[PDB]
Design an enzyme around this catalytic site. Structure first.
Site, PDB file in Angstrom:
ATOM      1  N   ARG A   1       0.141   9.113   1.149  1.00 57.02           N
ATOM      2  CA  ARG A   1      -0.543   9.032   2.436  1.00 57.02           C
ATOM      3  C   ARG A   1       0.286   8.300   3.502  1.00 57.02           C
ATOM      4  O   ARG A   1       0.232   8.642   4.685  1.00 57.02           O
ATOM      5  CB  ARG A   1      -1.868   8.292   2.257  1.00 57.02           C
ATOM      6  CG  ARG A   1      -2.843   8.956   1.280  1.00 57.02           C
ATOM      7  CD  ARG A   1      -3.680  10.018   1.833  1.00 57.02           C
ATOM      8  NE  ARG A   1      -4.913   9.477   2.376  1.00 57.02           N
ATOM      9  CZ  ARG A   1      -6.018  10.192   2.558  1.00 57.02           C
ATOM     10  NH1 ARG A   1      -6.039  11.479   2.240  1.00 57.02           N
ATOM     11  NH2 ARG A   1      -7.103   9.620   3.054  1.00 57.02           N
ATOM     12  N   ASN A   2       1.013   7.275   3.060  1.00 57.26           N
ATOM     13  CA  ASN A   2       1.910   6.474   3.905  1.00 57.26           C
ATOM     14  C   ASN A   2       3.403   6.782   3.684  1.00 57.26           C
ATOM     15  O   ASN A   2       4.255   5.899   3.819  1.00 57.26           O
ATOM     16  CB  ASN A   2       1.643   4.977   3.686  1.00 57.26           C
ATOM     17  CG  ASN A   2       0.265   4.549   4.150  1.00 57.26           C
ATOM     18  OD1 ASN A   2      -0.289   5.093   5.115  1.00 57.26           O
ATOM     19  ND2 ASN A   2      -0.297   3.551   3.475  1.00 57.26           N
TER      20      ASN A   2
ATOM     21  N   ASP B   1       0.839  -1.213   0.000  1.00 58.59           N
ATOM     22  CA  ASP B   1       0.000   0.000   0.000  1.00 58.59           C
ATOM     23  C   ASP B   1       0.873   1.262   0.000  1.00 58.59           C
ATOM     24  O   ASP B   1       0.663   2.197   0.779  1.00 58.59           O
ATOM     25  CB  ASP B   1      -0.984   0.004   1.183  1.00 58.59           C
ATOM     26  CG  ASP B   1      -2.054   1.107   1.074  1.00 58.59           C
ATOM     27  OD1 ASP B   1      -2.328   1.606  -0.041  1.00 58.59           O
ATOM     28  OD2 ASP B   1      -2.609   1.492   2.125  1.00 58.59           O
TER      29      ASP B   1
ATOM     30  N   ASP C   1       3.962   2.206   7.455  1.00 60.12           N
ATOM     31  CA  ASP C   1       3.026   1.090   7.252  1.00 60.12           C
ATOM     32  C   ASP C   1       3.521   0.014   6.289  1.00 60.12           C
ATOM     33  O   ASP C   1       2.723  -0.715   5.697  1.00 60.12           O
ATOM     34  CB  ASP C   1       1.643   1.606   6.816  1.00 60.12           C
ATOM     35  CG  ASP C   1       0.760   1.990   7.989  1.00 60.12           C
ATOM     36  OD1 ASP C   1       1.244   2.040   9.134  1.00 60.12           O
ATOM     37  OD2 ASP C   1      -0.436   2.252   7.756  1.00 60.12           O
TER      38      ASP C   1
HETATM   39  C1  LIG Z   1       2.306  15.202  12.290  1.00 60.18           C
HETATM   40  O1  LIG Z   1       2.192  14.120  11.358  1.00 60.18           O
HETATM   41  C2  LIG Z   1       2.486  12.844  11.721  1.00 60.18           C
HETATM   42  C3  LIG Z   1       3.746  12.544  12.172  1.00 60.18           C
HETATM   43  C4  LIG Z   1       4.080  11.237  12.537  1.00 60.18           C
HETATM   44  N1  LIG Z   1       5.307  10.959  12.973  1.00 60.18           N
HETATM   45  C5  LIG Z   1       5.638   9.726  13.296  1.00 60.18           C
HETATM   46  C6  LIG Z   1       4.755   8.654  13.241  1.00 60.18           C
HETATM   47  C7  LIG Z   1       3.445   8.871  12.807  1.00 60.18           C
HETATM   48  O2  LIG Z   1       2.490   7.899  12.733  1.00 60.18           O
HETATM   49  C8  LIG Z   1       2.796   6.592  12.608  1.00 60.18           C
HETATM   50  C9  LIG Z   1       2.837   6.042  11.339  1.00 60.18           C
HETATM   51  C10 LIG Z   1       3.148   4.707  11.196  1.00 60.18           C
HETATM   52  C11 LIG Z   1       3.438   3.923  12.316  1.00 60.18           C
HETATM   53  N2  LIG Z   1       3.755   2.563  12.226  1.00 60.18           N
HETATM   54  C12 LIG Z   1       4.563   2.030  11.279  1.00 60.18           C
HETATM   55  O3  LIG Z   1       5.105   2.700  10.406  1.00 60.18           O
HETATM   56  N3  LIG Z   1       4.745   0.700  11.352  1.00 60.18           N
HETATM   57  C13 LIG Z   1       5.550  -0.040  10.397  1.00 60.18           C
HETATM   58  C14 LIG Z   1       6.034  -1.458  10.707  1.00 60.18           C
HETATM   59  C15 LIG Z   1       4.764  -1.239   9.886  1.00 60.18           C
HETATM   60  C16 LIG Z   1       3.389   4.481  13.583  1.00 60.18           C
HETATM   61 CL1  LIG Z   1       3.737   3.477  14.944  1.00 60.18          CL
HETATM   62  C17 LIG Z   1       3.071   5.817  13.735  1.00 60.18           C
HETATM   63  C18 LIG Z   1       3.100  10.203  12.438  1.00 60.18           C
HETATM   64  C19 LIG Z   1       1.817  10.519  11.973  1.00 60.18           C
HETATM   65  C20 LIG Z   1       1.497  11.826  11.602  1.00 60.18           C
HETATM   66  C21 LIG Z   1       0.140  12.085  11.068  1.00 60.18           C
HETATM   67  N4  LIG Z   1      -0.267  13.305  10.656  1.00 60.18           N
HETATM   68  O4  LIG Z   1      -0.616  11.147  10.904  1.00 60.18           O
END
Ligand SMILES: COc1cc2nccc(Oc3ccc(NC(=O)NC4CC4)c(Cl)c3)c2cc1C(N)=O
Length: 284
Positions: free
Chosen positions: A151-152, A147, A165
């Site tokens: 967005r990711n 995916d 992700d």
């Molecule tokens: C301010 O914007 C963000 C900053 C982020 N920083 C770090 C991690 C974030 O979120 C995540 C995004 C992904 C994961 N997990 C993974 O990437 N896992 C990987 C092994 C599959 C985790 Cl924990 C936290 C964030 C999300 C935002 C946002 N606006 O949504």
């Protein structure tokens, strides 16, 4: 519910000052936080971090999922261009998974907010290169994203692209059901993945094609106004998206190469990195 300690990553809860939530539940109850002395060398420094945790009414299976995610990250290892694991709080309380913070949000939002500081033509290509590097690493560690999309892809204070992700297992998703934020996830899927449920590193490259289009349309929505049933027809008919306005012929050819009907004829991330490398070198 009794999780085993792992001293490599374990952090005391008293060293973790929680803060405001992040990103609209898109990543499953994440919060901003301040970790006091992650690096045992400089133990009096705060570091801004992201902290995922389980929801108010999470099931026993949701915990299983979150642990696999944590362990996946442990194994895959560190790279500049991916979201790296920093630590975790497993003992005597709820599970917290601590990861690198990305101050400037996801790539879609990042690009949309910076539509006409300006992004030089170089910034965009630079940005695409970085994602290709991150995907090359994940590919080198046998990790299929499934995916890949703007967005990711998260963006740091230093404007470093970090893939998120990746991995995140599951197993026939609904094509018709949307991201409640306003997105139809099937539009990034390669035909073989979409129709035959066959995910590969090549199917990721297809998605990277779509991600490139996202970049050079400054967060444009692919196949706008096309419902699922129609998308099927289009992909079957060999239809491919038009070149963006601000996007060279060389880069559009790269998109098209990524969208090659035959999977084995698509370029590898390895190659994409090399081409992008050269292209960044010659760009204002
Ligand atoms: C301010 O914007 C963000 C900053 C982020 N920083 C770090 C991690 C974030 O979120 C995540 C995004 C992904 C994961 N997990 C993974 O990437 N896992 C990987 C092994 C599959 C985790 Cl924990 C936290 C964030 C999300 C935002 C946002 N606006 O949504």
């Amino acid at each position: 519910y009794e999780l085993p300690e792992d001293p490599r990553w374990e952090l005391p809860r008293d060293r973790l000052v929680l803060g405001k939530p992040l990103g609209e539940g898109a990543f499953g109850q994440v919060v901003l936080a301040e970790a006091i002395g992650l690096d045992k060398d400089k133990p009096n420094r705060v570091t801004k971090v992201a902290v995922k945790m389980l929801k108010s009414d999470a099931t026993e299976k949701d915990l299983s999922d979150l642990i696999s995610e944590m362990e996946m990250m442990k194994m895959i290892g560190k790279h500049k261009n991916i979201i790296n694991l920093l630590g975790a709080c497993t003992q005597d309380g709820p599970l917290y998974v601590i990861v690198e913070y990305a101050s400037k949000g996801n790539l879609r939002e990042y690009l949309q907010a910076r539509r006409p500081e300006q992004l030089s033509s170089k910034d965009l290509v630079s940005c695409a290169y970085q994602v290709a590097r991150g995907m090359e690493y994940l590919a080198s560690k046998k990790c299929i994203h499934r995916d890949l999309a703007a967005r990711n892809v998260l963006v740091t204070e230093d404007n470093v692209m970090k893939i998120a992700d990746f991995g995140l297992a599951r197993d026939h998703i609904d094509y018709y059901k949307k991201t409640t934020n306003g997105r139809l996830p099937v539009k990034w899927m390669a035909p073989e993945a979409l129709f035959d449920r066959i995910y590969t590193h090549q199917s990721d490259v297809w998605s990277f094609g779509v991600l490139l289009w996202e970049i050079f349309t400054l967060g444009g929505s692919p196949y706008p106004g096309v419902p699922v049933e129609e998308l099927f027809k289009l992909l079957k008919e060999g239809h491919r998206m038009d070149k963006p306005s601000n996007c060279t012929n060389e880069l559009y050819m790269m998109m098209r190469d990524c969208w090659h009907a035959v999977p084995s004829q698509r370029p590898t991330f390895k190659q994409l990195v090399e081409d992008l490398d050269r292209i960044v070198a010659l760009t204002s």
